[PDB]
Amino acid sequence: YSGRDSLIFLVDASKAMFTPFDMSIQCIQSVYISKIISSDRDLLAVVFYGTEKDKNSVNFKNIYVLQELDNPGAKRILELDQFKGQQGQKRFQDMMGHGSDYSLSEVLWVCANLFSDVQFKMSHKRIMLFTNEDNPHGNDSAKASRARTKAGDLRDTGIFLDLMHLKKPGGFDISLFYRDIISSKLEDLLRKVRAKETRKRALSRLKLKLNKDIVISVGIYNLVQKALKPPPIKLYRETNEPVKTKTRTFNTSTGGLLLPSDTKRSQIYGSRQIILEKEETEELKRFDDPGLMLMGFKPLVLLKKHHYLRPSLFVYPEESLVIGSSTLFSALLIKCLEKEVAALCRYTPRRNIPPYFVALVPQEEELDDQKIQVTPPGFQLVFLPFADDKRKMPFATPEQVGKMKAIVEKLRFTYRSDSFENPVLQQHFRNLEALALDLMEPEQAVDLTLPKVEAMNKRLGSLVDEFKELVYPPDY
Amino acid sequence: NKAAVVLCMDVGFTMSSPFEQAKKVITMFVQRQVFAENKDEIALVLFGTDGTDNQNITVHRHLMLPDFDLLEDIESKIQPGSQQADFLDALIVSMDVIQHETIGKKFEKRHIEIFQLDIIIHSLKKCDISLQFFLPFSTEQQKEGLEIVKMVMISLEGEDGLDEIYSFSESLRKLCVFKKIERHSIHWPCRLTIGSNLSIRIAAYKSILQERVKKTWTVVDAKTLKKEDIQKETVYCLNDDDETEVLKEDIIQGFRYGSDIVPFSKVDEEQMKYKSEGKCFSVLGFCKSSQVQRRFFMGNQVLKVFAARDEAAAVALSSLIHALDDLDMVAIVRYAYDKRANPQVGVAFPHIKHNYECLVYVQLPFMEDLRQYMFSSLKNSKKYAPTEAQLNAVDALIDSMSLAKKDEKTDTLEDLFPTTKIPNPRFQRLFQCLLHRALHPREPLPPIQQHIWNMLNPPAEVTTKSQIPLSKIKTLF
DNA sequence: GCTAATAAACTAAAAACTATTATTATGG
DNA sequence: CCAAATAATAGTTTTTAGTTTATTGGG
C-alpha cells in the first residue's frame, strides 16, 4: 500500500496573541524530526490563518503559507526555528504580523487545494488543528454554515481533521462550534519518542505444496528485523556532493581491462588449484525447486531452546492465485491443542539458494481486552540448526538456593516489550539532529538499558551484603 | 588435535564383493582426511610385491600431508596383488617406519582401521596405539589370527571392545564414519556482575555459531590461472563532465538526513559518540518465562555460559541455575562483548543436562526491531470457516506422520527422523564437486549426487503412510 | 621472544511495490 | 506495407544474505 500520509499544521495566529502560541510551536517542533527519522515518505505543511502579510496560491486575505506539502527537511526546521521561543514569537509578530481576521471556510478551502496539488500516491489525509478557543467561530451564522459545509465536503472527499484542546480547559466535550461534525496529543507530539522504520509488503510468496501437486499460497511477514544505521554517502570535501564510485579489473600492468567472463573462480586445497566458473559456482548452491513441502510431524518435546538459529519469521494465510488456501489455513491453525506434534519442512526461498529445515509453530489468536488482535494466528518459522552449528563444550546447598531465590524475587522487572532501545542508534540520531538543526551544540540522550546501581540496591535492600556467605568468594 | 593413521589391508583373492566396499570406504576416508584440514601424515606399505626395497615388504608411500595427488595415486597405481606374504612382517615394517615419525614429530592419538602376539601386545598397548577392527562380514591361519586379535581387543577394551564390530551394511545403509567436519571455537573469559556488590568470574562460549566457510572464493584469470595477474582497482569518479579522479581524503562520509545529506567524518563520529567502554556483562532484571516469547528471539550467536576456568563460583552458578529453574525465573542481561562491542540486550536461561548444568544466553530485540502488522483473524472469519470434513481429513493427516518413538511408555519418545544432527548439505555438495573437478577437470557438470536426498527426506515408510491421508484430502479438494 | 582466531559494512543482487510499453486479434 | 484498441516486460526503491575490514597470541 504505497502512498503518502499528509498532515497540515494550522495555528491561531490572530487570537492566541490576539506563550499559548509558543506552546503550539513547541508541539509542532520535533515532529519533523520524528517524521524524518521514522518515514520520509510523507509530506507536511504549515499555514497560518490571520495575518497582515497573507500568502497563498489563491491569494486570499489573512492566509499565510510558510511551508507547503513536502518531505520534512532540515532547512524547513531551521527556518521554522526563527519563530521559536519568545524571540521567535516577537519575530513572528514583526515580519508577518498577527491579530487579523479569521476565515475558517477559506483556510479549509486552501488546505483542500493543497491536498489537491499533491502528485504522489495518497494514503491518509489528516489535518491537525490548534486553537485556544472551543467556540471561536461565534461570528455570523453564514460563515459557520459555510465552514460546516466545507468540512463535510472535505470529509466526504476523505480529508480528516482533528482538533484538540489547549490552554483553555474546555470543560467536558466543549467545542461548541466544532461538535456538529468533529468529535491529549500535546504530550504525544511533545514527548518526541522518535525511532521507527518503514513498512512495505512482506517476504516472498511461497507455494505450499502439501504432497507434490496441491499448491497453497502463503505470505511470510517479518515482525522483527535487526536495526541498522543509514548507509554513509561518499561526499566531496570541497563541495559536499555525492561521488559516483568506479571499479574495474586490471591485468597487472598489461593494459587490458578484464571482463567478468575473462576471469574464473578458483579454490586452493593443499596442492591442487581447483578452477570453477561464476555460473558454475552459483549452480553449486542450487539444490531443489523452491517451495514448501511438509516433511511430517515432530512432537514439541524434541525441541529445546538451547539450540537456536537465525531469528524466526511469521507466515500468514494468503490467497494470491489459489482459492481455498485460506480455508486450509483455518483448518490447520485451529489444530493447535492436539497438534503439539510440530510439523516439519525445509525452507527454500528461491532456486540457486541453499535449503534450510524450518519448523513451523502454530501461533494462536492473541486477542486483547481492547478487542485488538496482536500477533495474528500463524506459524513461527523457527530455523533448525545443522550439525556444524555446535562448537566444543568444556567440562549448591539449598540455603544458598533460597538466598538467591529471595534475591531474584525481591528485585524483578515486568519486562515491558518496548522498554529497551539501542543507545548507539539513538545517540547517532541525536548527533545527526544536532549537527543538522538547532541545538548546534550537541546533546546526548539517556538509555534505560543500563542497570541501576543503588536504586536496584534499595529495591533489593542490603541483603546481598550479608549474602556474600559463600566461603572464600571467587574474587581474586 | 594430532592423529597418526596407517593402512594395513588383507587384500587379495580373500576379498573377492567386499573388496569394492573396502576400496570405496578407503577413498571416502582419504577424501574426508583431505577436506577436513587435518595435519596427519599418512603412509602406505605393501606386502608380497614384486621387487625388494631392503621380507617381501615393499614400502610405497612415506609420511606426508594428504593431498589430491596421493588419492589419485591410490586410486590408479594400487591394484590387488597375486602374492602371499606374512602380514606380521608388514606390521613390523609399519611400526619401524612409524618409530622415526613419532620421534621426529610428536602426535596425540593413533587410529587404525581395516576393511607374534607378544609383539602386538607390547606395541599396541604401549602408550596410545589403538585400532578399530571393521569386518566385511555381517585362511584358517587368518581366522585364528582374527580371533586372537578379537580376544586381545575385548580384553584391552572390555564391553566397549565387545560392541565395536560393524558390518559394511551398517557402514552403507546407516552412517558409521561420515561426519569428520568441524570448526574450532575460541573461549571468551569474562566476569558476571550482579549490580554493584556481586562480581563473579565466568567463562563464555559460543554454543550455536552460524555456518562459516574455512576458505574463500579466489578469482583467477582464464589464462594465467593466478591472482597475481589480476589487479583489483576501485576509484571515485567526481561528478563532473568527464572522469576526474578524487583521492580518499577528499571523500566525506555524508549521511542522508531526511531530504538532505549532511557531511560527516568517521573520525568525528568517534570524537562525539559514545559506546559501552570495556566489557559490560551485567544482569539487568528478572521476570517470568511466560512474558518471554519465541517471537522475540533475535540474533544469531548462542552464548553458553559456564563458571570461570573457581569451584565456589561453579557451585554458586549451579545454585543460581536451580533457583531460576524451580521458580521459572528468567534474568535480563546487558551484554557487551568488549570495549568496542555494540551494546546488546538479551536473556539467558539455564541449560539442563545430566553431565553438567549450563547457562545459555540469547540476545533480545529493541522496540525498533519489533514491527506491527494488523491482520484479520481467521478463527472467527465466517467467510473462510473450515468444513468439518476438512477437519477430519487434516486430523487423519496429522496422526499419519509420527516421527517420534511413541510405542513404549517406560521409554521416552525418540525421533525416527532426526533433524538437528544433519549438517549443511551444501558443504558436502561443494566438497564432492571439488573432488569431481580434481578427478575430472575436463568433464563438466558434476552429478547432483542424489544419495544426499535419502537422509534429507523422511523415511519411505512414513511417506507410504502419508500416501493415504493425502489421497483422501486430494479427493476432498 | 612467537599468526590457534573474531565484535567487521561493502560496493552488496539472486523481488517490480507501479508505473509505459508494445504484439496481437484487429475491421467496415 | 501503416489500419486502432488492448495484455504483457519492464525505466523507479524498496529487505536481506556473502561480502570486505583490526585486535587475537602460536617458532
Author numbering:
A (entry chain B): 32 to 49, 58 to 222, 237 to 448, 454 to 534
B (entry chain C): 6 to 21, 29 to 66, 75 to 135, 146 to 168, 198 to 368, 370 to 537
Paper text:
Non-homologous end joining (NHEJ) is nearly ubiquitous as a DNA repair mechanism and is one of the two main mechanisms utilized to repair DNA double-strand breaks (DSBs) in humans. In NHEJ, DSBs are first recognized by the Ku70/80 heterodimer, which subsequently recruits the DNA-dependent protein kinase catalytic subunit (DNA-PKcs), a large protein kinase belonging to the phosphoinositide-3-kinase-related kinase (PIKK) family. The final step in NHEJ involves DNA ligase IV (LigIV), which acts to ligate the two broken ends and forms a constitutive complex with XRCC4 known as LX4. In this study, we present monomeric and dimeric NHEJ super-complex cryo-EM structures consisting of DNA-PK, XRCC4, LigIV, and XLF.
While classifying particles from the DNA-PK-LX4-XLF dataset, we identified a dimeric form of the assembly that differs from the Ku80-mediated DNA-PK dimeric arrangement seen previously. The structure of this new dimer of DNA-PK at 4.1-Å resolution is mediated predominantly via interactions within the circular cradle. Specifically, the loop of residues 898–901 (loop 1) interacts with the loop of residues 2567–2572 (loop 3) on the opposite protomer. There is a further interaction between residues 946–950 (loop 2) and 2578–2583 (loop 4). The arrangement of this new dimer would allow the PQR and possibly the ABCDE phosphorylation clusters on one protomer to be in close proximity to the kinase domain on the opposite protomer. The juxtaposition of phosphorylation and kinase sites within the dimer may explain how these residues are phosphorylated when they are distant from the kinase active site within the DNA-PKcs monomer. It is also apparent that the LX4 and XLF interactions with the DNA-PK monomer are largely maintained in this dimeric form, with a single XLF homodimer positioned along the dimer axis. The distance between the two DNA double-strand ends in the XLF-mediated dimeric supercomplex is ~115 Å; this compares exceptionally well with the previously measured distance between the two DNA ends in the proposed long-range synaptic dimer complex as measured by single-molecule fluorescence resonance energy transfer (FRET). Within the new dimeric supercomplex form of DNA-PK it is clear that there are major structural rearrangements compared with the monomeric supercomplex structure, with the most notable changes occurring within the head domain of DNA-PKcs. One of the most striking features of the new dimeric structure is the ordering of a helix (residues 2737–2765) within the circular cradle of DNA-PKcs.
